Design a protein around this ligand. Structure first.
Ligand code: CLR
Ligand code: CLR
Lengths: 49, 48
């Protein structure tokens, strides 16, 4: 009843902190990605590469 | 894009010269869309 939930929640919280610090460091946004090999096209991309 | 008659310039990666070569306009943006594309299969898969 307790130890499994505690361990799983601990791992989930560790991952949540490790990703929240990354989102804090790198502000989210949208980028107009373009390719010189193709051009004439603009891709609205999530700021994560 | 010909900024002047004698000298030709560029609008940058984001912008493109117009058909009349008189100004720089933002290029259309592309993304995954539900309107008759490869997303119908993934949508049905997610629903199932
Ligand atoms: C959705 C997430 C983020 C939070 C909720 C999940 C946790 C807190 C929930 C989900 C399932 C729940 C358990 C379901 C069944 C039992 C067995 C019972 O004899 C005592 C309570 C206990 C042990 C519950 C405790 C709380 C519990 C562990
Ligand atoms: C008490 C709990 C259950 C509240 C909900 C927790 C989650 C959903 C919340 C708590 C704090 C939140 C973060 C707070 C601030 C930022 C910076 C922003 O630039 C991107 C989103 C981001 C990274 C949020 C993501 C969602 C977040 C992690």
């Amino acid at each position: 009843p307790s130890s499994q939930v505690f361990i799983c929640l601990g791992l989930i919280l560790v991952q949540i902190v490790m990703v929240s610090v990354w989102l804090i460091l790198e502000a989210p946004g949208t980028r107009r990605y373009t390719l010189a090999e193709k051009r004439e096209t603009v891709i609205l991309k999530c700021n994560v590469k | 894009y010909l900024a002047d008659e004698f000298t030709c310039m560029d609008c940058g990666s984001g912008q493109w010269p117009t058909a009349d070569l008189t100004g720089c306009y933002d290029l259309p943006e592309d993304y995954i869309r539900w309107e008759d594309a490869w997303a119908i299969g993934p949508v049905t898969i997610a629903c199932l």
